[PDB]
Amino acid sequence: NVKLSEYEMSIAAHLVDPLNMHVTWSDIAGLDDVITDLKDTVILPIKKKHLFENSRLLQPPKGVLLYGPPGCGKTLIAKATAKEAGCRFINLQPSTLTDKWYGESQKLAAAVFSLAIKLQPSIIFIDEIDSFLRNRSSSDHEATAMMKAQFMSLWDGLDTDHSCQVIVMGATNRPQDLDSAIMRRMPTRFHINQPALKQREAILKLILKNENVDRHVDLLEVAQETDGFSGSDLKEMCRDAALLCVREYVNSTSEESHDEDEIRPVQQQDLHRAIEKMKKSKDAAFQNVL
Amino acid sequence: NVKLSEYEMSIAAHLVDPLNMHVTWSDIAGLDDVITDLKDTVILPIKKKHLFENSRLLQPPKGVLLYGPPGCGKTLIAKATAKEAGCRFINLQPSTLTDKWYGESQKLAAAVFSLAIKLQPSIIFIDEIDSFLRNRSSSDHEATAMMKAQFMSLWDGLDTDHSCQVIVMGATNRPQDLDSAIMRRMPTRFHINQPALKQREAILKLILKNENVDRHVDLLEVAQETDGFSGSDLKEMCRDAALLCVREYVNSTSEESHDEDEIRPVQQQDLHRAIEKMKKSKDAAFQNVL
Amino acid sequence: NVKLSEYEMSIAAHLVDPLNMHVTWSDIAGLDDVITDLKDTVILPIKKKHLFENSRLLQPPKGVLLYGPPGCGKTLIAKATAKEAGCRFINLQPSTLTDKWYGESQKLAAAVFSLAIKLQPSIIFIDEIDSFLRNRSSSDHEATAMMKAQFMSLWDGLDTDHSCQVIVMGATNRPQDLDSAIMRRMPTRFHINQPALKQREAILKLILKNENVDRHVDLLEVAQETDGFSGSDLKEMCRDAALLCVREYVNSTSEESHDEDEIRPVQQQDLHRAIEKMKKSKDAAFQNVL
Amino acid sequence: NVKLSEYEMSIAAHLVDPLNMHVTWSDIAGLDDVITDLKDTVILPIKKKHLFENSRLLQPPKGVLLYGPPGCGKTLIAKATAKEAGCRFINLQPSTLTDKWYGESQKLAAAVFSLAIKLQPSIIFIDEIDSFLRNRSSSDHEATAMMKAQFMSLWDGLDTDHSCQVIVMGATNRPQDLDSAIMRRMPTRFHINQPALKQREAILKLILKNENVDRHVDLLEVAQETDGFSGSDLKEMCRDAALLCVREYVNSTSEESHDEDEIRPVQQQDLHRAIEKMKKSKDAAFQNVL
Amino acid sequence: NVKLSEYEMSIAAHLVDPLNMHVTWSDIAGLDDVITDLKDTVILPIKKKHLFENSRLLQPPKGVLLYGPPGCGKTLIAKATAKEAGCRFINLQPSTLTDKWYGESQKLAAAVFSLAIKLQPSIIFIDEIDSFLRNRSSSDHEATAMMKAQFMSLWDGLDTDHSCQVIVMGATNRPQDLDSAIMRRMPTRFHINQPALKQREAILKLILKNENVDRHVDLLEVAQETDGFSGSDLKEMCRDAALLCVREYVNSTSEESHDEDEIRPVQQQDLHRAIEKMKKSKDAAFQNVL
Amino acid sequence: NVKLSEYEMSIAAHLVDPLNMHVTWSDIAGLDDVITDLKDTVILPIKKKHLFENSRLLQPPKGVLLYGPPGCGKTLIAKATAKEAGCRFINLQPSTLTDKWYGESQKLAAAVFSLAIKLQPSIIFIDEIDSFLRNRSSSDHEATAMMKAQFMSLWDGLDTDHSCQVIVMGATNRPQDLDSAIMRRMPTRFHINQPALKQREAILKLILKNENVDRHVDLLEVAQETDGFSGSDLKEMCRDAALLCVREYVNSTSEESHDEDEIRPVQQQDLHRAIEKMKKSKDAAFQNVL
Ligand SMILES: Nc1ncnc2c1ncn2[C@@H]1O[C@H](COP(=O)(O)OP(=O)(O)OP(O)(O)=S)[C@@H](O)[C@H]1O
Ligand SMILES: Nc1ncnc2c1ncn2[C@@H]1O[C@H](COP(=O)(O)OP(=O)(O)OP(O)(O)=S)[C@@H](O)[C@H]1O
Ligand SMILES: Nc1ncnc2c1ncn2[C@@H]1O[C@H](COP(=O)(O)OP(=O)(O)OP(O)(O)=S)[C@@H](O)[C@H]1O
Ligand SMILES: Nc1ncnc2c1ncn2[C@@H]1O[C@H](COP(=O)(O)OP(=O)(O)OP(O)(O)=S)[C@@H](O)[C@H]1O
Ligand SMILES: Nc1ncnc2c1ncn2[C@@H]1O[C@H](COP(=O)(O)OP(=O)(O)OP(O)(O)=S)[C@@H](O)[C@H]1O
Ligand SMILES: Nc1ncnc2c1ncn2[C@@H]1O[C@H](COP(=O)(O)OP(=O)(O)OP(O)(O)=S)[C@@H](O)[C@H]1O
């Protein structure tokens, strides 16, 4: 029902659909405290905004930054917040603004915020935000400065309107590189920390929850052996274990075994061997370093 | 037994026949690790799908991409997987979709996936996938955009149905050209690497396996001298050697030699000379470059 | 009077004739500033070259690229420049170089520039230049690389000769796809922009100039209502209006009306209804998108 | 009253007679929108040309191409336009130009257009236009090239004369085969589409209009059952039904029935059985395919 | 001794006789490298097939295509291979399959391959192969599709039988027109190139070999002056020279010259004048083009 | 004569040719002191290295960095040094290393320095060096770290070998962004400063040196009025002046002026007006800022 210019139709294409996203609060673990903080601060003003207006403050923050090591679940939480918020979420990947030839860039940068302002409430997200305004070339440097100026001016415009309903969000793996202008902005900042021992156990429980598992698995030992890994690496370790079991099954089946079609369930030794091989992969990477 | 529209009958024509294909796992070498990975990941869920459903994951990937230099055996492995999988394989060459005149295009793009969905399990393949959605003309640009949108929408539809049984596959020689939409899709990606020294020796063994060969041939030297070549070039080098032997035989026979009808077997010097001439052909190409 | 090889006779066939082309400077509107820039920079050195040689610079650019959305008049301006320049113009459509079988390709790529160099001054044009060197197949990839190398080498040859008199030109609808080699070449680049409100009014004046029009038509309202369209769509909108008037005339004539043979002139309501129906067609396209 | 050379008298023989043609606008159905477009664009300028000259444009198109699957009524509409236009219509079947021996060919190709130009207004038609310039032999290839060059040159001549009054038309079943030269020509192109459900019902109404029919026939069911057919096949299905009724009549009459000489009128069951047998014929063709 | 159906007797009529063919390897020049390749690849497996079976490969190719400009000797080499191979050669001119009325077509297409399979080894040839499956008419289109399907199915049947001994061959002047199905077939392809300077000298030597020639003729100059011609044109140029000498002889004899009955031998000036007149004929053709 | 791996052949393609570069010491002005420093320090050890080895020091620096505002001539001086040095110059644009998919990256980074080490003496250059090791993505971050480590390790390797003959060079517009690792490297650093009043006058003299100029031009006033510009802007200002003169010439010629074909020479008022218009362009940019 929104009225659009060619620019705003271009932005409308990047808008995500809440009916095709998958992840939810039920599909996240190991961050539940940060989950609680993010939910309470961001989602609550978004969903029922009029409730929180009787205050100069606790108005939804004009900037949210997620910072944490790679593989800690930053993109996962971005998607989960986008879906669970129930609002409109724009994924503003860098190519959207680094228009190398067209003066169309200025109106396009304007149109991003224009569509966001039309669609109230809505959330803007920038993955790899450190790279957002850095690309340079003979045709881009002056245009890069113009894009910088326009983006901060429109951000200040969002700040200026007391009736604004839109938030801007970002993620990054090496956040120190962020420009001082960003550092002065993005007031509220949430650390997506690596999972501790208990958090690692929670992560393993979430992953294994709908795997085929023998009840007598003990995970805390797996939690210790996995302490060197990140969340994505935890996922990939459960991967190596499952595929290892599948390999041994297929190799045993070929030797004239009966066609029962049933597999050995996940057992402690499986994850032990998988973790050893995962550490071997890390060791290959380290030898490449050494 | 399938019920078809004119579109689906048109697609049914492109469907390959598992009774006329030749190549098998017994006719591939130098990639056995990638062969193992492809087999385990793709074929196993395809053949006995119900076995792998007790998991949110290890479900057959929604996209498989093969990337490797020309002549490394990408088409060979595509055919080998198609036959060995035992499923239905559709070869979706570009002309199938670049309908330049008929609005029939939309229904045809729909019918490809329609037939694939009817035929469960089945695999879709696109050779030269980089060129799949690039052809342009005065009558094609808008239709090209429509085809793009429809193909990704139907791909998302395959993703949406948890009961989907169909995979889509692609190959390409210059894969960097691939559109970012493809890059975001095709999660699992297998590198068809060039044969290393040991892999090259394996390739030569496979080729010579049913040639007429003197046992005292030594190949590792041939492996080193062939290191500059690709697999197709290895094949063509064995070609030049065999034909060279045939030429010398016929020239010796004409000079009043007895009609014994027996040829000199493959010997080291034959492949040495053939490889030298092959490098001479490469040198002619290089001089054309220079 | 030129001496030709079979290749150069093949190229000579594609050469356009300045006596059968139609469009002129008198038949172009809405771009007059870009028209002025193109005329001054390109045509002036072409026609009276010796005038501009007393300078290391302002020599005709070694590459001209036209970039603008579809329907903005890129082909029209290409033809207009070709005719008005009075020089020889070669339309180098892609099929000229994508010779799929003959080694004739190399000599053919050479012959294009050979004929251009013989015919001084002359202009080379490549519509859909992005597709110029992209077509690929089992028989084409290596030949594609050879064609690439030859074309840039001959372009560098044109650059090398200070007495060169030939220009190369190109057009494209999605120019970002252009190879970085092209981006490094084609120094002077002209944007064929969409018509603004005043430019749109000029376009409508040009189209209606020799239509049958009632003087009391007001166009600025038509200019606003047409702002969503492109130039080709402006042309097609005047189309729908004229044909609508013809339809109502023929339907009124059949009902025993006198045989006066005179039609209702173009009036505001005609274009209003035609524009509404044109927007309805755009709406049908949008619903197909939605 | 025209003055003729032997060539032009030969062409004059192929000219059709508007007093012996049968079909009219009253004898066509299922295409009425395409009928309207063709009528408005082609016939109106033809009949009262001076009316449309006060425009650079909407002048009768220099080429009309009809493309549609076999049996969709392309020849029928060609004849209907020829008669209803009231102009002179030349049926230029391929043999007219593939003169295998006589240098008479050149003057004959000239004479076709010569007679057309003398006879203003007139329409040239080429059925199976894809085959028009393809026949080859030891005595024909060079002559084939000459014929190609002459035909496009004379077509360009028709384009050149602003006072030209003649149109050229063509039809084809596999139009993709058309040479790129044709594709660049023939600007206006009309799709003779297959009849949709409503169009199929209209076709059946047209066919049955002057058959002997019981009023309680219901056709929409026949329309659905006939959806697999083409227009010619619809005609042939009404054929099988009528002849089936005649067969049962004659077989019932021979058994000492009274000589009343009256037949069972067309009823639903008749067309049901006829359509079943028609689908059986299609099934025999399919089994031949299978 | 073969057992035949009416169809196979009809095909047996087209079979050529190795005792009435003329041309041989001793009567071909200017292609000796392509001659060597064709001989080695085709003839050797044909004549002594059991010699080459100890290999999955170097089995006679399932398709040979000859492509080259008109007059380069394609038919000559076809005949030479047919005779020198010593096998049975079938000349499958297009009329053999374009049966316009009889359902006999299907069995006839079957019978071609049936006789070929009975007669082992044998070679099938199709001149003007591009026209092989293109002829169309109201009575032919569906039959054309049936013929296409049958021919590729029987070709696949030849591919399927590892004991097959028959080859299929084709020639064409404009081979790009070939259907993609053919392009996917016919693996081995030999280019019948135009004669280069040395090849042209060889051609002239072959032609003059048994003419009456003065030893002091120099041909390399004739080779340069003839470079614009093709092989057939070289033959026809030697023609014009010989007939020119005969004309001058007869004109000198009539003027009361003695009845010695001896002619001036071929000398340089004769071929010089003949080549000038030949170029004059080419010039007349060019002026017709211009 | 160098022996190359596929990687080193890929690098060999980027190597520039000293026979096609244009600029020289004779084509640079306004930096002659920095020119002298660069020449003495870099070129002298490069050309006659054995002369400078009798010292632990004044060995060619292991890193040269050029830093200056955009348009000050950094690329010009890079090219001038590359040509005048007479050595081999590699232009290492960022895409060479940001290989997004292939493990080929590691060997490619090695091959850059490998070819440089083989080709002694040679100079490596990185334009936009700040962006050299910054690009990031899901597939690049770990590879980015690996590339960083490899590049500094190979740089340390160049430092380690006392017989090293290769230099590495870089340029950048916003050099503060440079990583601290770079800051610790690149010992010798040359500032490409903006032209002062005298330097600006020298720049104008260089540009006008082979323009058509009236001797009574006074430049110091032009030098003051141009003080706000950069070198590229100085060039573009001389541009606007020359083109302005050409425009007035062409407009005066059309009005029935005699065909003398002579233009008004460059005069003070021309540059005055051109500079005013240039400042107007700067003012438009400023208003966009404001
Ligand atoms: N706490 C968690 N709960 C569930 N999944 C997690 C968690 N942490 C990480 N993951 C997994 O990590 C994956 C991807 O890693 P992410 O950290 O979300 O991506 P990322 O943060 O963008 O890393 P990069 O380097 O920026 S691409 C998903 O497949 C998640 O399942
Ligand atoms: N590992 C291998 N084992 C057996 N044959 C191989 C192998 N690698 C390459 N080949 C041969 O390579 C051939 C064709 O090369 P492919 O790499 O399969 O085709 P391709 O990948 O499509 O190359 P292009 O450039 O895309 S056509 C076949 O004849 C194979 O026998
Ligand atoms: N400024 C203009 N003045 C006159 N005609 C114009 C103008 N802009 C567009 N047109 C019309 O646009 C037509 C064709 O559109 P073009 O833009 O020239 O073709 P194009 O740029 O090649 O578009 P594509 O997508 O590349 S085929 C012609 O019929 C012109 O009359
Ligand atoms: N819409 C229609 N109205 C009336 N008759 C139709 C219609 N469509 C097809 N026909 C019948 O179709 C017949 C012949 O088919 P056509 O399509 O006109 O011939 P065609 O297009 O040349 O087919 P081919 O394959 O080219 S011979 C005539 O007998 C018509 O009566
Ligand atoms: N290398 C050659 N050696 C001998 N005769 C040749 C040679 N090349 C061409 N000819 C002559 O060319 C003749 C006929 O030309 P061909 O090329 O064999 O026929 P073609 O290839 O079918 O041409 P078309 O256009 O297809 S009929 C014969 O009379 C040959 O003597
Ligand atoms: N001192 C100078 N002498 C001659 N030409 C100069 C001088 N300074 C700048 N230029 C001109 O400046 C041009 C390009 O500007 P450069 O400064 O060399 O490029 P640059 O340093 O890469 O700028 P960017 O922003 O990095 S693309 C060339 O056309 C030179 O002619």
From Swiss-Prot, chains A, B, C, D, E, F:
Enzyme Commission number, as recorded: 7.4.2.-
GO MF annotation list: ATP binding; ATP hydrolysis activity; membrane protein dislocase activity
Domain of life according to the entry: Eukaryota
Cytoplasmic side: 1-290
Membrane topology: Single-pass membrane protein
Assigned keywords, A-Z: ATP-binding, Cell membrane, Membrane, Mitochondrion, Mitochondrion outer membrane, Nucleotide-binding, Peroxisome, Phosphoprotein, Postsynaptic cell membrane, Synapse, Translocase, Transmembrane, Transmembrane helix
Enzyme class, broadest EC rank: translocase
Modified residues (Phosphoserine): S257
Gene Ontology CC: glutamatergic synapse; mitochondrial outer membrane; mitochondrion; peroxisomal membrane; postsynapse; postsynaptic membrane
Catalytic activity: [protein]-with a C-terminal TM segment(out) + ATP + H2O = [protein]-with a C-terminal TM segment(in) + ADP + phosphate + H(+)
Binding site for ATP: G68, P69, P70, G71, C72, G73, K74, T75
UniProt-listed GO biological process terms: extraction of mislocalized protein from mitochondrial outer membrane; learning; memory; negative regulation of synaptic transmission, glutamatergic; positive regulation of receptor internalization; regulation of postsynaptic neurotransmitter receptor internalization
Subunit structure: Interacts with GRIA2 and GRIP1 in an ATP-dependent manner. ATAD1-catalyzed ATP hydrolysis disrupts not only its binding to GRIA2 and GRIP1, but also interaction between GRIP1 and GRIA2, leading to AMPAR complex disassembly.
Entry similarity comment: Belongs to the AAA ATPase family. MSP1 subfamily.
Name of the molecule in the record: Outer mitochondrial transmembrane helix translocase
Organism: Mus musculus
Gene that encodes it: Atad1
Part of the whole protein covered: 66 to 355 of 361
